[PDB]
Amino acid sequence: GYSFSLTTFSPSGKLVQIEYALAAVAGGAPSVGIKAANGVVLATEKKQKSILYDERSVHKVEPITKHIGLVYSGMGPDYRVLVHRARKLAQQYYLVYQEPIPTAQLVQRVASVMQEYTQSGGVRPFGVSLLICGWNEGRPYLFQSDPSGAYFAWKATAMGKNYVNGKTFLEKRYNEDLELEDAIHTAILTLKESFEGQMTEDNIEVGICNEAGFRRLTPTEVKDYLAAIA
Amino acid sequence: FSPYVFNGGTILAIAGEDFAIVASDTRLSEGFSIHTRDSPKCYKLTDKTVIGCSGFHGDCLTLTKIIEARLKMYKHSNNKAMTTGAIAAMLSTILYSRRFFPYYVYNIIGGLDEEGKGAVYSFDPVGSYQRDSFKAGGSASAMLQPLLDNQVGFKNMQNVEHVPLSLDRAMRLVKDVFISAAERDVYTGDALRICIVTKEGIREETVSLRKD
Amino acid sequence: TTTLAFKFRHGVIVAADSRATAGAYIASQTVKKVIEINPYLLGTMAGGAADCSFWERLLARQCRIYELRNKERISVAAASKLLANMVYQYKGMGLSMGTMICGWDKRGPGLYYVDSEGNRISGATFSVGSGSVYAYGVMDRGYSYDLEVEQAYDLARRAIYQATYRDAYSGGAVNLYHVREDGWIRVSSDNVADLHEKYS
Amino acid sequence: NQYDNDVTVWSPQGRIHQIEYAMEAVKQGSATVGLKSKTHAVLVALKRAQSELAAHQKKILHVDNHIGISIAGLTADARLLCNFMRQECLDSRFVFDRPLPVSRLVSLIGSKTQIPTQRYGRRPYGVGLLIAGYDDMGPHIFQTCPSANYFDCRAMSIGARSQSARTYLERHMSEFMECNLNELVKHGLRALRETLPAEQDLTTKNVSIGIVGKDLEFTIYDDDDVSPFLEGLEERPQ
Amino acid sequence: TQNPMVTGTSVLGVKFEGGVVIAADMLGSYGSLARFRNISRIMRVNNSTMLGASGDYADFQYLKQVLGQMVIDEELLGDGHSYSPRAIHSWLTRAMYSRRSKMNPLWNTMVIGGYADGESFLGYVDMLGVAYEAPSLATGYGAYLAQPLLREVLEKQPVLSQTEARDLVERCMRVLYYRDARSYNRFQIATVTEKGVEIEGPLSTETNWDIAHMI
Amino acid sequence: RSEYDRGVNTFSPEGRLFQVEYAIEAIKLGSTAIGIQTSEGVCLAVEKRITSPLMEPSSIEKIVEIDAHIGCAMSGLIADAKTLIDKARVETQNHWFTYNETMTVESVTQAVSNLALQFGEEDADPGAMSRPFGVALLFGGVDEKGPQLFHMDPSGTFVQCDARAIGSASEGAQSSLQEVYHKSMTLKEAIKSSLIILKQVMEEKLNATNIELATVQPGQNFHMFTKEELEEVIKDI
Amino acid sequence: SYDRAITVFSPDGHLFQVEYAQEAVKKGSTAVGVRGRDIVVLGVEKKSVAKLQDERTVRKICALDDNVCMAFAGLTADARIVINRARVECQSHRLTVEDPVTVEYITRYIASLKQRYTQSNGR
Amino acid sequence: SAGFDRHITIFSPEGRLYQVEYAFKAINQGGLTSVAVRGKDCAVIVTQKKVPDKLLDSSTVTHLFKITENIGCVMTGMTADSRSQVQRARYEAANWKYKYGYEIPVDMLCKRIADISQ
Amino acid sequence: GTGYDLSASTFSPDGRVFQVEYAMKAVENSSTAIGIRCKDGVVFGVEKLVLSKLYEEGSNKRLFNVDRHVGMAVAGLLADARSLADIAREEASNFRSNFGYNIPLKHLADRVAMYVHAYTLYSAVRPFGCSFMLGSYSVNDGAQLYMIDPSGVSYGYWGCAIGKARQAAKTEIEKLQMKEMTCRDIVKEVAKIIYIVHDEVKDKAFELELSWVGELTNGRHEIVPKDIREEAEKYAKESLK
Amino acid sequence: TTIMAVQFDGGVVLGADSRTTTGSYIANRVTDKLTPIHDRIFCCRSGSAADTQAVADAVTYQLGFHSIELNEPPLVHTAASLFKEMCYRYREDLMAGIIIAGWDPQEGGQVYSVPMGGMMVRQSFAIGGSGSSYIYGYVDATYREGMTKEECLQFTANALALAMERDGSSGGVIRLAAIAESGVERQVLLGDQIPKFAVAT
């Protein structure tokens, strides 16, 4: 196998392939994460290129643990690999400590794996950016992981296509004292700022995390919220 | 489970001024039963050296095949034949290379040195060796040893000249001591294989022994 | 098998017998128990003859390697330490060996005792073997640093003679060596019965 | 060129160039002639000396009592392959207590030389070997190449200027089966003489002879031993 | 294998003018129990070699597919070379010495028969790699019962015909069935000659019990 | 395509490796050495090429002792041939251990020649080599076949030579050896002629400091000539 | 594992990487060693030390064994690796031999290590 | 294009792996079209069976492949990758049955195959 | 374009692998070998170009015995063909050692297909330069015959032709009432087709290698005997006048 | 533990007990020892429960893999070869006796026995297990050649019930399978359905 790193310094001192993966992320689907006072909401576009797709067969918002969830922007299978890695790391932490894994530690370990994927020979950095939500110590947690392997803790953030407009919209519409329902409303409205076409309960995916843990919104609740907002 | 079986056998070698004689019994046995009456334990190494190996017969065959492989390897490597002291070095190193799992063999090397003189080398199962004028190995070794010690080596003797060893006296001595070996050692009998190494080469003969 | 060695004002005296047995049967009476490692270093052999011979031969190979690579004659102490190193690895797997390394180096006459048990002792006087105590009793009376060459020869020869008279596994012939500043010399190889007739 | 760097890269016409450079290295070496009778196999090899103060390079390698090898090309690759097949003969005598058959041996030679032509970054062994052998079915003259192709020949010549020797062996091909050992060696000497320039003739110093067959171990005659075989050779007709 | 579980009993073999005849019964004994009565212990290698053996049958079954594989390897080249009985002797000796060497030997003792280049061949390989050639060979209790009769016949007549050797091994198996508690009155006889290897199936010997009336 | 972009095993159109040709070219940048084989022994004489008055001449070693009956003479890179001479010494002691006898000079020659072409970049063991040695060696010794001198080159080709010269002035000194050697030539004549040829091929004045001389004789060990003996050998030249 | 040969033959036979290392040596500070009769004296040219920089961390003179010391010219960290290897070799030789090293022995070892770094891939 | 992104699977300046699109353009080299439709109570695959030579065995030139009893599959692309992917899918189904003790679901098996593709 | 035709691990912009096509062309400049499966066996016929008269009879064999019931027919580089023949022999030996009976020819063809195409995925190895044919007979499966190219694709065939003159020999095979007609005239028609497709102007005089497997040898693959070979040779020569 | 099988014209009949013990305590009384390998290939296990279960599962997995690969029904001989290889290769750690009976269209119904040590042989009827040794004379005295399916079942039930009565390691119920062209038919005899034998002393 190749022991030569595919990610090397340019003469300018930059990592060009990390910029390439960031450009791939900017071509990805939007992912809006809002940390409310009692949970974190993650919402994403789930637009299918045809009606023949089985929408409920393949998802984009998945739970690592009961109280930890994740959404991405970028490449699907790389995101699937990172979900595999994150679930295995969280279960490793559970085997060692028999306690629920803190969100920041899972963020640290997933970021470390995706960091060494930017250094190891013959491998490529993942074309994903991640929004990781969780609840631990009676507190909600929201983080982002970048193709550079860096990770930033966020109260509200937007990724994917038209991420600048989503970030400006969230800056204009985030409050610390926001409840969970209002965070859901703001996340769906932020998805409306970058969506093309009429929104259904099938072309988006929303999950929330609170003191009861992390779970995904059913299409009944999604269509109820969509009827409430519009 | 036991990996070693004592198959019996008595070998002997004597060194002369320009010749050597290597003799062996032909009986190969186990316990109180004879496998075969014709197993001569003198095998040809070179034009000037004969090996003699007794003990575990599978170990004897392994020693012969390993030593002939090393023979041919040296002929290809250095484009010349053995020297007898180097053969002794090869056998000693081969025996000691498996000190934790030894060959159950007693070995003698008989032939000519680089000056044409007789050369006999005695070995143990675990690699010790020495050059001697004569050596008896095998089951009946220690019985045939003092006959060479007093007749050829002149021990416990008084007031007669140490005469040089001729060929006829040597072969008569070997025949008589192996007749005595057949008469007492139960693994010794049937026949006697004798080879004589001189500058012209190595010659062979066989003497019938007792069959019980 | 009884070997002895002692340092004194003119060098090192080494003495040995030549009897080797296989069990209760005397295998031979002409076995050389002193190896000539180099023109300035000798080594003794006592116990397992194959073990002693092969490890002393490997010591000769290693000291010749050192002389080739560093252009210097090996000291007694370094040779004994490398001997203890390569026998220490095979400790506990059945090695039976006891040797004395004698020689002359930059520090002068050097004598060391090494075994298969990892012992490496410096001392002026040593003797190894089953009948080593018989040699010890004679030499503790005979030894002095101010001894000359001939009475040291006689003391070593008499001690080996007493050991061969008192030990069943000791006999054959007495071989003597004298390591000096110019190297070792071979003194004599005298028969035991002639020594008994001489000392009677 | 773009397709002459590696053995795994294929030309549009379907040829591997590096193997052809290996056979050109074989053609760079001096000439040897392998020829067999009904009972004998003889290799006549032309030895070369790098200088007048240097001895002639050895070209005939004896391996077993029934098998000998003459080389053409790189000497070290020939040594490596020759030692591998030496230990193959040693293994056959060790396990089977029989001489190794020549045909399966050279099949294994082709099997080994198959692998450097298919792996990345590795070169074929740039030497071509003429093989004198004997087994129960008779004597054999074989040839092996860096292209992992082996050929059975009644007579063969390889090396520098071997085309004239090949013509000479082709012109007398029906006689070699009935020629005796002396006539076979004389024919091989004349064939190797056909490789030589018109200003130089066969000497004892540059000819090696390797003979195997009935009542004959593979013996290498060199220097003065070549002198009786040079006797009786006719001069070159104009 | 450290413990042979079901074993094979005595196998006999003897030379004659033009070939070698080897005979053995099909009794696989479950220790003391006569478990299997129709399992062949005499197997043909090729046109010029054949084997019989005593001891564990799973190990010799393994020996069967490995010998068949190396034989088929021989004719699949198509060079014309074939495995001589002496080469098979050498390979069997190397294999058994190797198996004894790494402390997991094959619990089988083999009588090997052959006829090649106008010469007969009979060889013996034990469980520990000791191998030797003899005109008449026997295993187990046969090595204490039949081979005295074989040696007595050979001392007064070294050269036999096929019918003489057949009668001799028939008498030897009558003695073996009379005396071996691990024997059975149902055996196969095979013969290796220039025409090849021939195996004969349903063979039993006559039994005499008149001595039981001599009380 | 530059010449640096091809592998170490890449063949020339003539059929040779480029790296061994580069090593053969690097032979010509080394010091001048002459070995002469006589019936009285083999003599070796190598120029030190002292490049500075601060350079210690005794720190310049060119002639080495393989073992007590075999010495060697040098042309080429010092750092590679140090490892080659160490390999030769280890092989001599290996054969002295296992066989209880010394090998021939020729056995030394193939045992040192067989590691010359063991270089490669692909599937290489830990301990392998990226470039062949640029070292040519002259082995002079005494064995059971008499005094012997051999030449070894980086290609692995080893030959027997009655009188061989290697180094920068190898061709002219070889022609000089051609016009001074005969089969009835003594060891003293070999020493005198070899130093005469070194004097005519070196760019300096020949003195006892910038040359090394050694002799191997039957019945004698390997001998290093001292500076005084070098001076009296110089005296009649 | 990285197995790219850094130093290879040029067509004129020179080794460019060793020459660049020699240029890096010549860029380094001057070190002079003089052997006296019962003394050896080393002297290195101290660079202009920064006013807030400690002079004990920039010492170019270090000992390799209790009788053998050294001075270097070149990169400081590579010299630190050389010194550490020399120290562990001196301690290993003292363990193996029960004698301290000689100057020629440890010099031969460190230069053999340097030449080994000239004769491998990825190094 | 930057570097060897056209030759191997490394990112373009647009962030696109050209070898994936080359795999897409190697899919259609077989010249086939397979249609798989889910019914209310069935699933049906229809593919092309091109037999241009009558010497070809019609029983051997096929694209409908059987993983296990319950799961079947239709294939697009070239034949060696076709047999390789169906063999790996059969091996993964057998490993699922050997580990988890039941027949592999279709979604799980195609997830494993696409992960191998990743 | 540049760079797409150097490795077997890179595609063309159209989606092609140039190294596999170069392996196809290295097949297409080799001598013609045909193989026909009929009602009671599989018979192979190989045109062996005698490039030099110094070679002995029996040199450069393209008919191999893969197994005691399985025969082999190659066209291309002989070294790759011999290596793949050894691979197939080892696979048959492995099948016998694991299972204890004769290997089905579809199975062994699949295995050699897997071992051929597995080297067409990498830049570190090259595709083989040889197309080949496997032919076997058994009582239960009858006669079966398979075609495998360097691309690693196995196709069942009733009869096939490869080499320089694969199209002409294929059309000649297409003209035969074949599924009912015996091996003893299969071999004669193979001789006729091989002598028809050989071009005497552009190639040297050749040898007609011939072999079969089927009921007449109880499912065993063997080379054609001398008298039958010269009979088929005389029939083929008498069809050319 | 008692297991056996009889071959008839048309297929095979497998019969077994159901007692599985460790020591003198009955761990289970209703263990199904007629382990299915394939749809018309069954095996009978005696000895160590874990070893027999592991080798049966491994052979079933491998046989399913090979039958899918070849796209053919598995031969009973091929399955028996797989059992023979696994039992011979691991003969120093397993205590297992397997009686493999099945039907294939190529060779009809076949019985093979893999005893301790890993031997392989084909037979008309195979007996194995702990109870096996107590019925040999009976099964050497009652079997007849060319024997019918239902009377193979009757013979199986009688020999099984005799081993039930004699062996303390045999117990529980009687389990029967019949493999033929129509497939596998499975039956359980219990209580009065077990064939009784007169023991009156």
PDB file of N, CA, C and O in Angstrom, chain D residues 92-98 100-104 107 135-137 140, chain E residues 70 73-74 77 79-84 86-88 90-92 94:
ATOM      1  N   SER D  92      16.168 -32.293  -4.292  1.00  0.00           N
ATOM      2  CA  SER D  92      15.697 -33.508  -4.952  1.00  0.00           C
ATOM      3  C   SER D  92      16.491 -34.726  -4.506  1.00  0.00           C
ATOM      4  O   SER D  92      15.933 -35.817  -4.348  1.00  0.00           O
ATOM      5  N   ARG D  93      17.799 -34.564  -4.310  1.00  0.00           N
ATOM      6  CA  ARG D  93      18.596 -35.676  -3.811  1.00  0.00           C
ATOM      7  C   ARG D  93      18.352 -35.919  -2.326  1.00  0.00           C
ATOM      8  O   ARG D  93      18.495 -37.052  -1.851  1.00  0.00           O
ATOM      9  N   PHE D  94      17.987 -34.873  -1.583  1.00  0.00           N
ATOM     10  CA  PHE D  94      17.770 -35.001  -0.146  1.00  0.00           C
ATOM     11  C   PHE D  94      16.462 -35.717   0.166  1.00  0.00           C
ATOM     12  O   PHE D  94      16.420 -36.597   1.032  1.00  0.00           O
ATOM     13  N   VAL D  95      15.386 -35.354  -0.527  1.00  0.00           N
ATOM     14  CA  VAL D  95      14.057 -35.853  -0.183  1.00  0.00           C
ATOM     15  C   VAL D  95      13.712 -37.108  -0.971  1.00  0.00           C
ATOM     16  O   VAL D  95      13.140 -38.059  -0.431  1.00  0.00           O
ATOM     17  N   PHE D  96      14.057 -37.133  -2.254  1.00  0.00           N
ATOM     18  CA  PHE D  96      13.637 -38.199  -3.152  1.00  0.00           C
ATOM     19  C   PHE D  96      14.719 -39.242  -3.393  1.00  0.00           C
ATOM     20  O   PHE D  96      14.406 -40.318  -3.913  1.00  0.00           O
ATOM     21  N   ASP D  97      15.968 -38.946  -3.011  1.00  0.00           N
ATOM     22  CA  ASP D  97      17.128 -39.822  -3.218  1.00  0.00           C
ATOM     23  C   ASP D  97      17.276 -40.213  -4.685  1.00  0.00           C
ATOM     24  O   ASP D  97      17.565 -41.363  -5.023  1.00  0.00           O
ATOM     25  N   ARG D  98      17.055 -39.245  -5.567  1.00  0.00           N
ATOM     26  CA  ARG D  98      17.167 -39.450  -7.000  1.00  0.00           C
ATOM     27  C   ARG D  98      17.683 -38.162  -7.620  1.00  0.00           C
ATOM     28  O   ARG D  98      17.509 -37.087  -7.033  1.00  0.00           O
ATOM     29  N   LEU D 100      17.426 -35.020 -10.004  1.00  0.00           N
ATOM     30  CA  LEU D 100      16.253 -34.275 -10.436  1.00  0.00           C
ATOM     31  C   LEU D 100      16.134 -34.351 -11.952  1.00  0.00           C
ATOM     32  O   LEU D 100      17.134 -34.165 -12.656  1.00  0.00           O
ATOM     33  N   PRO D 101      14.955 -34.674 -12.488  1.00  0.00           N
ATOM     34  CA  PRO D 101      14.754 -34.596 -13.938  1.00  0.00           C
ATOM     35  C   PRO D 101      14.975 -33.191 -14.477  1.00  0.00           C
ATOM     36  O   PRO D 101      14.602 -32.193 -13.858  1.00  0.00           O
ATOM     37  N   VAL D 102      15.586 -33.136 -15.661  1.00  0.00           N
ATOM     38  CA  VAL D 102      16.039 -31.866 -16.214  1.00  0.00           C
ATOM     39  C   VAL D 102      14.850 -31.024 -16.671  1.00  0.00           C
ATOM     40  O   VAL D 102      14.835 -29.797 -16.496  1.00  0.00           O
ATOM     41  N   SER D 103      13.822 -31.673 -17.233  1.00  0.00           N
ATOM     42  CA  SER D 103      12.703 -30.950 -17.834  1.00  0.00           C
ATOM     43  C   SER D 103      11.875 -30.208 -16.789  1.00  0.00           C
ATOM     44  O   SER D 103      11.560 -29.026 -16.971  1.00  0.00           O
ATOM     45  N   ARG D 104      11.514 -30.882 -15.691  1.00  0.00           N
ATOM     46  CA  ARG D 104      10.777 -30.213 -14.621  1.00  0.00           C
ATOM     47  C   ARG D 104      11.621 -29.138 -13.950  1.00  0.00           C
ATOM     48  O   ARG D 104      11.085 -28.116 -13.501  1.00  0.00           O
ATOM     49  N   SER D 107      11.449 -26.224 -16.215  1.00  0.00           N
ATOM     50  CA  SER D 107      10.098 -25.700 -16.029  1.00  0.00           C
ATOM     51  C   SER D 107      10.019 -24.823 -14.785  1.00  0.00           C
ATOM     52  O   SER D 107       9.400 -23.754 -14.808  1.00  0.00           O
ATOM     53  N   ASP D 135      18.876 -37.383 -18.257  1.00  0.00           N
ATOM     54  CA  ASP D 135      17.942 -38.105 -17.409  1.00  0.00           C
ATOM     55  C   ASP D 135      17.622 -39.427 -18.102  1.00  0.00           C
ATOM     56  O   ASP D 135      18.252 -39.781 -19.104  1.00  0.00           O
ATOM     57  N   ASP D 136      16.623 -40.146 -17.572  1.00  0.00           N
ATOM     58  CA  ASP D 136      16.360 -41.519 -18.004  1.00  0.00           C
ATOM     59  C   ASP D 136      15.952 -41.595 -19.471  1.00  0.00           C
ATOM     60  O   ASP D 136      16.202 -42.607 -20.136  1.00  0.00           O
ATOM     61  N   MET D 137      15.343 -40.536 -19.991  1.00  0.00           N
ATOM     62  CA  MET D 137      14.908 -40.482 -21.376  1.00  0.00           C
ATOM     63  C   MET D 137      16.018 -40.044 -22.320  1.00  0.00           C
ATOM     64  O   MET D 137      15.805 -40.023 -23.535  1.00  0.00           O
ATOM     65  N   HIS D 140      19.962 -33.923 -22.944  1.00  0.00           N
ATOM     66  CA  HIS D 140      19.157 -32.754 -23.263  1.00  0.00           C
ATOM     67  C   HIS D 140      20.051 -31.539 -23.408  1.00  0.00           C
ATOM     68  O   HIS D 140      20.969 -31.335 -22.607  1.00  0.00           O
TER      69      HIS D 140
ATOM     70  N   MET E  70       0.566 -36.195  -4.921  1.00  0.00           N
ATOM     71  CA  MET E  70       1.913 -36.105  -5.483  1.00  0.00           C
ATOM     72  C   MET E  70       2.074 -37.007  -6.707  1.00  0.00           C
ATOM     73  O   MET E  70       2.779 -36.638  -7.661  1.00  0.00           O
ATOM     74  N   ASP E  73       0.322 -35.119  -9.465  1.00  0.00           N
ATOM     75  CA  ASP E  73       1.299 -34.092  -9.817  1.00  0.00           C
ATOM     76  C   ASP E  73       2.355 -34.652 -10.762  1.00  0.00           C
ATOM     77  O   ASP E  73       2.782 -33.969 -11.701  1.00  0.00           O
ATOM     78  N   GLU E  74       2.771 -35.902 -10.544  1.00  0.00           N
ATOM     79  CA  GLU E  74       3.744 -36.505 -11.452  1.00  0.00           C
ATOM     80  C   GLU E  74       3.175 -36.697 -12.857  1.00  0.00           C
ATOM     81  O   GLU E  74       3.829 -36.330 -13.840  1.00  0.00           O
ATOM     82  N   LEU E  77       2.321 -33.324 -15.359  1.00  0.00           N
ATOM     83  CA  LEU E  77       3.342 -32.660 -16.161  1.00  0.00           C
ATOM     84  C   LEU E  77       3.460 -33.296 -17.540  1.00  0.00           C
ATOM     85  O   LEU E  77       3.674 -32.596 -18.537  1.00  0.00           O
ATOM     86  N   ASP E  79       5.818 -35.309 -18.615  1.00  0.00           N
ATOM     87  CA  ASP E  79       7.195 -35.413 -19.077  1.00  0.00           C
ATOM     88  C   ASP E  79       7.606 -36.843 -19.395  1.00  0.00           C
ATOM     89  O   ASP E  79       8.564 -37.046 -20.146  1.00  0.00           O
ATOM     90  N   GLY E  80       6.900 -37.829 -18.849  1.00  0.00           N
ATOM     91  CA  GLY E  80       7.271 -39.219 -18.984  1.00  0.00           C
ATOM     92  C   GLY E  80       7.924 -39.811 -17.755  1.00  0.00           C
ATOM     93  O   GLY E  80       8.069 -41.037 -17.677  1.00  0.00           O
ATOM     94  N   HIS E  81       8.317 -38.978 -16.798  1.00  0.00           N
ATOM     95  CA  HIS E  81       8.883 -39.453 -15.548  1.00  0.00           C
ATOM     96  C   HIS E  81       7.782 -40.015 -14.661  1.00  0.00           C
ATOM     97  O   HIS E  81       6.647 -39.534 -14.666  1.00  0.00           O
ATOM     98  N   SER E  82       8.127 -41.058 -13.911  1.00  0.00           N
ATOM     99  CA  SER E  82       7.206 -41.675 -12.969  1.00  0.00           C
ATOM    100  C   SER E  82       7.944 -41.924 -11.664  1.00  0.00           C
ATOM    101  O   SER E  82       9.174 -42.013 -11.633  1.00  0.00           O
ATOM    102  N   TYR E  83       7.184 -42.033 -10.579  1.00  0.00           N
ATOM    103  CA  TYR E  83       7.785 -42.204  -9.263  1.00  0.00           C
ATOM    104  C   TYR E  83       8.262 -43.638  -9.078  1.00  0.00           C
ATOM    105  O   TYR E  83       7.455 -44.576  -9.056  1.00  0.00           O
ATOM    106  N   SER E  84       9.575 -43.801  -8.950  1.00  0.00           N
ATOM    107  CA  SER E  84      10.148 -45.095  -8.645  1.00  0.00           C
ATOM    108  C   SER E  84       9.779 -45.500  -7.220  1.00  0.00           C
ATOM    109  O   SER E  84       9.501 -44.641  -6.379  1.00  0.00           O
ATOM    110  N   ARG E  86      11.800 -46.599  -5.008  1.00  0.00           N
ATOM    111  CA  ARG E  86      12.844 -46.111  -4.113  1.00  0.00           C
ATOM    112  C   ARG E  86      12.675 -44.626  -3.817  1.00  0.00           C
ATOM    113  O   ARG E  86      12.956 -44.173  -2.702  1.00  0.00           O
ATOM    114  N   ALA E  87      12.219 -43.850  -4.804  1.00  0.00           N
ATOM    115  CA  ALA E  87      11.927 -42.441  -4.556  1.00  0.00           C
ATOM    116  C   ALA E  87      10.758 -42.286  -3.593  1.00  0.00           C
ATOM    117  O   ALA E  87      10.762 -41.391  -2.740  1.00  0.00           O
ATOM    118  N   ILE E  88       9.752 -43.153  -3.717  1.00  0.00           N
ATOM    119  CA  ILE E  88       8.630 -43.144  -2.787  1.00  0.00           C
ATOM    120  C   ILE E  88       9.084 -43.577  -1.397  1.00  0.00           C
ATOM    121  O   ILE E  88       8.620 -43.040  -0.383  1.00  0.00           O
ATOM    122  N   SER E  90      12.105 -42.954  -0.204  1.00  0.00           N
ATOM    123  CA  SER E  90      12.817 -41.797   0.325  1.00  0.00           C
ATOM    124  C   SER E  90      11.853 -40.712   0.789  1.00  0.00           C
ATOM    125  O   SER E  90      12.034 -40.135   1.866  1.00  0.00           O
ATOM    126  N   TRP E  91      10.818 -40.429  -0.007  1.00  0.00           N
ATOM    127  CA  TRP E  91       9.846 -39.408   0.371  1.00  0.00           C
ATOM    128  C   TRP E  91       9.075 -39.803   1.625  1.00  0.00           C
ATOM    129  O   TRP E  91       8.835 -38.963   2.503  1.00  0.00           O
ATOM    130  N   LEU E  92       8.681 -41.075   1.725  1.00  0.00           N
ATOM    131  CA  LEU E  92       7.992 -41.554   2.917  1.00  0.00           C
ATOM    132  C   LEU E  92       8.893 -41.479   4.141  1.00  0.00           C
ATOM    133  O   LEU E  92       8.440 -41.116   5.235  1.00  0.00           O
ATOM    134  N   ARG E  94      11.421 -39.346   4.604  1.00  0.00           N
ATOM    135  CA  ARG E  94      11.542 -37.936   4.966  1.00  0.00           C
ATOM    136  C   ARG E  94      10.290 -37.437   5.673  1.00  0.00           C
ATOM    137  O   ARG E  94      10.383 -36.718   6.675  1.00  0.00           O
TER     138      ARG E  94
END
